[PDB]
């Protein structure tokens, strides 16, 4: 699990979204793995805006931080989950690292701010939804 908290935005993974999520949906979209919801609470974290390829991410399965290079958003095909049939996943990013489904949620970050959130993995590969493109969670 995990959120990112900007402005009066929550951005979840999709498949982890809440009820309340739903009740106050801003945008969803289901191929990227994606959902940004209201708060009344003021948000404390920055999106990077950059094309960086390293970064680091949280992983909870090994409680551990590993820094990775990954590949630039794009659209992957993602094996079957417990959440989602087998489909094209856009706006994801790849690196070679430990990932386990309830690792979802763990951040990615460079030195501009969050880049994206755990989304896919398996066969020793991590899978990032990218948030960098998505601008008016800034203002
Ligand atoms: C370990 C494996 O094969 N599945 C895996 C790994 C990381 C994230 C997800 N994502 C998801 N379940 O939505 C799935
Ligand atoms: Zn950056």
């Given at each position: ?28 979209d289901?191929s990227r793995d994606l ?37 630039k958003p794009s659209l992957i ?12 996943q856009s706006h994801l990013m ?22 994206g959130?755990?989304s ?8 990032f939804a990218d948030v960098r493109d998505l ?5």
């Amino acid at each position: 699990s995990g959120a990112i908290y900007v402005g009066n935005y929550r951005v979840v993974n999709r498949h982890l979204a809440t009820h309340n999520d739903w009740a106050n949906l801003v945008w969803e979209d289901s191929s990227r793995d994606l959902l940004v919801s209201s708060t009344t609470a003021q948000g404390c974290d920055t999106i990077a805006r950059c094309d960086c390829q390293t970064g680091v991410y949280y992983c909870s399965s090994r409680r551990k931080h590993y820094p990775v290079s990954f590949s630039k958003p794009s659209l992957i095909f993602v094996e079957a989950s417990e959440y989602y049939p087998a489909r094209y996943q856009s706006h994801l990013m790849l690196a070679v690292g430990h990932s386990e489904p309830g690792d979802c949620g763990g951040i990615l970050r460079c030195q501009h701010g969050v880049v994206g959130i755990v989304s896919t993995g398996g066969n020793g590969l991590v899978g990032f939804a990218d948030v960098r493109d998505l601008l008016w969670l800034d203002e």
